[PDB]
Amino acid sequence: CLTDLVNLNLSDTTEKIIAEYIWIGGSGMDLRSKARTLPGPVTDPSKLPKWNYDGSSTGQAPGEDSEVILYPQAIFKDPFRRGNNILVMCDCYTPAGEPIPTNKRYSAAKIFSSPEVAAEEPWYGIEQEYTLLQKDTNWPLGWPIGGFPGPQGPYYCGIGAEKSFGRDIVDAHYKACLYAGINISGINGEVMPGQWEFQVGPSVGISSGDQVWVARYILERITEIAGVVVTFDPKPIPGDWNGAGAHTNYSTESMRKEGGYEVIKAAIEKLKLRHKEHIAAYGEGNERRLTGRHETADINTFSWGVANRGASVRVGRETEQNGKGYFEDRRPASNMDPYVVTSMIAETTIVWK
């Protein structure tokens, strides 16, 4: 029957390939994709033809001038179609070669090409938290309808049927990602029952943004299979329940070398000064998450400390004791555009004075 067809091995019959072009839609938060057949395997992004789609249907163009252009930027193996088929992360342009307003990759690319940044070779590990929800009722997975599970406490990194909801989805994603070639560093059950996390491990500059988006694309496709819905809303349930963020861990060449801890403090300092303008691009709805309770710092103050999950930035015990490592900006929400957060951190930390 149905899975025999979806899992057909094509290699036995043609050289042809299926490429799934992924892009980001009109809201800056919606992933979209379509697929095309290509005549043979491809490993280099610049050897893939450009393409277009109906921008008038994604809120990015008018009906009379509907075409919007897709620039292939990164290739990953398609864990769904398997064999030689591929996912292609994309960039969006007018037919005139202008990047459209919702393309935030272009700006970020410039910052990561700019040679004083490139030389610092920044590293990002981003911690994507999300929440799983029952289709149609829109209530968190594992929660009874019109009710709540036991209070927070046993859920964080837990095991068992009354504690841990949807490991299925999570472990699936983890391998999918690995197979695809995403640098995924690890996963964990989070504090609010039904909330999970994966980390896209230390990735350089632009490719961090690319990998987080593709990882999210894979997550949602998996949840789609499962008949479950994901939100990246930073505070999906009001009251005594954790919000969800996208912690950004960060380091520069000079931060991970001898006496980098000094560079770290100095970077934090610069961040303190540009808190206000960082918050503004750190994803919407954040006001509902950053309250000072539930392992956040208040939106209005900026703070930092060592093992302090109540602070705006946190520095690992390990990197303190070694005088070198990385720090964690805990401010960005789970619905953060990594392109924006990732480059803005480099900019406020290297370029600006």
Ligand X SMILES: Nc1ncnc2c1ncn2[C@@H]1O[C@H](COP(=O)(O)OP(=O)(O)O)[C@@H](O)[C@H]1O
Ligand Y SMILES: C[P@](=O)(CC[C@H](N)C(=O)O)OP(=O)(O)O
Contact code string over 299-328 relative to ligand X, x by CB under 6 A: --------------------------xx-x
Query: What is the secondary structure of 21-55 as a DSSP string?
Result: EEEE-TTSS-EEEEEEEESS----GGGSPPEEEEG
Count, residues near ligand X per rule CB under 6 A: 17
58 binds ligand Y (CB under 6 A): no
Query: Looking at 233-298, which runs of residues are DSSP E strands?
Result: 246-251
Q: Contact at 8 Å (CB) between 32 and 19?
A: no
Q: How much helix, strand and coil, in percent to the nearest 5, is found in the chain?
A: 30, 25, 45
Task: Select from a second copy, Mn ion, ligand X, none the partner in contact with residue 33, using the beta carbon and a kind-dependent cut-off of 5 to 8 Å.
Answer: a second copy
Q: How far is the CB of 127 from Mn ion (least distance, A)?
A: 4
> Binding residues for Mn ion, per CB under 5 A?
127, 129, 197, 247
Nearer CB in complex with Mn ion: 111/245: 245
129 binds ligand Y (CB under 6 A): yes
Nearer CB in complex with a second copy: 80/106: 80
Span interacting with ligand X, options 40-48, 105-113, 122-130, 151-159, rule CB under 6 A = 122-130
Q: Contact at 8 Å (CB) between 230 and 128?
A: no
Residue ranges in 148-167 that form contacts with a second copy under rule CB under 8 A: 148-151, 153-154, 156-164, 167
Question: What does the alpha-carbon distance between residue 241 and residue 221 come to, in Å, rounded to a whole number?
Answer: 26
DSSP state of 46: G
Token couple for 14: 């043609």
Residues 6+ apart with CB under 8 A from 243: 234, 235, 236, 288, 289, 290, 294, 296, 333, 334
Residues 6+ apart with CB under 8 A from 22: 31, 32, 33, 87, 88, 89, 90, 213, 214, 217
Choice from 79, 236, 245, 260 touching a second copy (CB under 8 A): 79
| 108-111-113-114 Cα dihedral, nearest 10 degrees | 170
Token couple for 83: 């064999």
233 binds ligand Y (CB under 6 A): no
Q: How far is the CB of 56 from ligand Y (least distance, A)?
A: 7
Choice from 118, 188, 288, 347 touching a second copy (CB under 8 A): 188
Nearer CB in complex with a second copy: 269/318: 318
Residue ranges in 187-206 that form contacts with ligand Y under rule CB under 6 A: 190-191, 197
Which positions lie near ligand Y, rule CB under 6 A?
A: 54, 57, 127, 129, 190-191, 197, 242-245, 247, 289, 294-296, 309
Which positions lie near ligand X, rule CB under 6 A?
A: 123-125, 127, 185-186, 199, 201-202, 247, 249-251, 256, 325-326, 328
